[PDB]
Amino acid sequence: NGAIKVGAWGGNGGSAFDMGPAYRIISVKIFSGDVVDAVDVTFTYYGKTETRHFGGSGGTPHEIVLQEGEYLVGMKGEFGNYHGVVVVGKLGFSTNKKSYGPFGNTGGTPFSLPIAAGKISGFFGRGGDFIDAIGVYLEP
Amino acid sequence: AIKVGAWGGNGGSAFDMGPAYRIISVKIFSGDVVDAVDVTFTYYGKTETRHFGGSGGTPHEIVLQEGEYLVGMKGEFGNYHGVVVVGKLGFSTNKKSYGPFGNTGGTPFSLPIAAGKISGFFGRGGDFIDAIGVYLEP
Ligand SMILES: OC[C@H]1O[C@H](O)[C@@H](O)[C@@H](O)[C@@H]1O
Ligand SMILES: OC[C@H]1O[C@H](O)[C@@H](O)[C@@H](O)[C@@H]1O
Ligand SMILES: OC[C@H]1O[C@H](O)[C@@H](O)[C@@H](O)[C@@H]1O
Ligand SMILES: OC[C@H]1O[C@H](O)[C@@H](O)[C@@H](O)[C@@H]1O
Ligand SMILES: OC[C@H]1O[C@H](O)[C@@H](O)[C@@H](O)[C@@H]1O
Ligand SMILES: OC[C@H]1O[C@H](O)[C@@H](O)[C@@H](O)[C@@H]1O
Ligand SMILES: [Zn+2]
Ligand SMILES: [Zn+2]
Hints:
The structure is a homodimer.
Chain A: E1 4-10, E2 15-21, E3 24-32, E4 36-44, E5 49-55, E6 60-65, E7 72-81, E8 86-95, E9 99-103, E10 109-117, E11 119-127, E12 133-139
The complex binds alpha-D-mannopyranose (6 copies) and zinc ion (2 copies).
The site of one alpha-D-mannopyranose has 6 residues of chain A, from loops.
């Protein structure tokens, strides 16, 4: 394959998910309340349009629609205890155009992934009731 | 090229070793803070050593064996007497964990590499290691 995967950041709970790399990420939808509940990813994969449903369905959706020539070049957030579970409390992304988030209201251990060269092409991690952990595929 | 980071502050001057064929060793010089790093590596048939940061601190060496690669970097950055620098720095290989080295807490960062390896470094250096970033390959 030749994949580059960094992360996941967060807890060891939930069940592993892995969408693999995409030809093109179309949109990312972060479901969010006190904590990061979930992430939906809409993408094309070769060339068919699929959307994957990660984490849980609580919280409020916050959608990042990527325009033409717009790519994800950063991810940051925080993970910490929420009711006996270590999950992502905050999650944000930046693109080559704009910054998004963070979404979620629970402080914890910060992580940050500035990408000086390259971009995010896919996601993996762990999900249950909430988003326990999130990691990322990279490509040039 | 895949470059992630750098984590740290905006002081010092920019360094960039580029990607290596193979990392041979990493020597982290630290006391209160991360002072410097020596990286020994091969590159198109040549063996090279680069030094980043200053001359202070106590050395802690990571020597990588055959088929051993760097699969993680973690640390902390913060204001140490006027400059935002790496106060703690650690690495992990596919065999072993090292450090972190340095005694000054600040803002944590972590880079676990689920697939791929660290192949090189970039960042900023002066008296101490202001910032450190990493080249990644499969
Ligand atoms: O994020 C955890 C939780 O936070 C709040 O309690 C609400 O917004 C819920 O919908 C959500 O599931
Ligand atoms: O404004 C963003 C903000 O909106 C709501 O209050 C929640 O979904 C939060 O988790 C989120 O951070
Ligand atoms: O998502 C947080 C939490 O939700 C559920 O209770 C389970 O799936 C846990 O394993 C998981 O850690
Ligand atoms: O390395 C820490 C510090 O050392 C020197 O004082 C200068 O090179 C600064 O620019 C740098 O921030
Ligand atoms: O790390 C900063 C500083 O910490 C201590 O004072 C000593 O170990 C020095 O050698 C070093 O320069
Ligand atoms: O911070 C870890 C590291 O920092 C300095 O170099 C010294 O105090 C060492 O004894 C120690 O192992
Ligand atoms: Zn969904
Ligand atoms: Zn030695």
